[PDB]
């Protein structure tokens, strides 16, 4: 899914 702790797609 969207990871938002990265800002990005895992």
Same mark, same amino acid.
């Given at each position: +899914?969207?990871?938002?702790? =990265? +800002? =990005?797609? +895992?």
């Amino acid at each position: +899914g969207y990871d938002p702790e =990265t +800002g =990005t797609w +895992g």
